[PDB]
Design a protein around this ligand. Structure first.
Ligand SMILES: Cn1cc(CCO)c2c3c(c(-c4ccccc4Cl)cc21)C(=O)NC3=O
Ligand SMILES: [Cl-]
Length: 257
């Protein structure tokens, strides 16, 4: 196999199939390589599997999207940029336990970086559809969007919904008029997680209350300007939320730019 002869496996970094940290023998370099069961040819699962690859391959010029090098094929493999700093989810678990979270200046920088990623994705007429901390990777720290498995075209009539902790009500209601603002809503909840919040609910009354536009408790004092920008980003009306372009140019974020 090309995987075996081309790469030396260093360590398993993800299970689900598996992602390994590998050194390509020819270029000396470390890559994250994801191995999955190859779906039946011409199936709906294969189409979903191939969109991730097509997405990766138009989304390779961006500072805040994980770079793609190659993909090939009873397994499919994708070889991406290895991010040395881990996921934002793991940074956020380490913080949780030590009672020291991202401070406001770092929450702004996270928000702005990912927001530039989404601006790039959105201007490609694409949407990500699973923005959450386990799909933001760290490598000045850099934040990069990864895991392009739910990526779709912006006017798509059918959608695979992302994680329910981070899901906009209108997407759940099957309303895809404003898909870009689903990414916006998930970015805000991602930032709240990073600020120190309790694990987000997956359903039930607390789930609904957030979808009414109310921020979860944040165990630290943020400026009103900043808090207000997070709240508008979870507004029940997707049209009231900022576009990624509006986000990155927002005055609240100027001091991060
Ligand atoms: C579980 N896991 C951990 C990591 C490294 C964090 O230090 C990781 C990465 C990726 C991916 C990934 C996600 C989705 C599709 C393909 C890949 Cl290679 C998954 C990763 C990826 O594309 N780049 C990564 O670093
Ligand atoms: Cl997560």
């Amino acid at each position: 196999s090309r995987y075996t002869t081309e790469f030396h496996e260093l360590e398993k970094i993800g299970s689900g199939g598996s992602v390994f940290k590998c050194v390509k023998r020819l270029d000396g370099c470390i890559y994250a390589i994801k191995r999955s069961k190859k779906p039946l040819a011409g199936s709906v699962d294969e189409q979903n599997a191939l969109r991730e690859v097509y997405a990766h391959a138009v989304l390779g010029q961006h500072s805040h999207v994980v770079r793609y090098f190659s993909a090939w094929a009873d397994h499919m493999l994708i070889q991406n940029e290895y991010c040395n700093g881990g996921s934002l989810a793991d940074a956020i678990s380490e913080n949780y336990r030590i009672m020291s979270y991202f401070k406001e200046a770092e929450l702004k920088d996270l928000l702005l970086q990912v927001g530039r990623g989404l601006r790039y994705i959105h201007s490609m007429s694409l949407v990500h559809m699973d923005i959450k901390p386990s799909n933001i990777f760290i490598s000045k720290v850099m934040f990069k969007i990864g895991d392009l498995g739910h990526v779709t075209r912006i006017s798509s009539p059918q959608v695979e919904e992302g994680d329910s902790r981070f899901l906009a009500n209108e997407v759940l209601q099957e309303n895809y008029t404003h898909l870009p603002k689903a990414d916006i809503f998930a970015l805000a909840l991602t930032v709240v997680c990073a600020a120190g919040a309790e694990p987000l609910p997956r359903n039930g009354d607390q789930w609904h209350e957030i979808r009414q536009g109310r921020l979860p408790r944040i165990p630290q004092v943020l400026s009103q300007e900043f808090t207000e920008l997070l709240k508008v980003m979870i507004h029940p009306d997707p049209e009231r939320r900022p576009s990624a372009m509006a986000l990155v140019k927002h005055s609240v974020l100027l001091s991060a730019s």
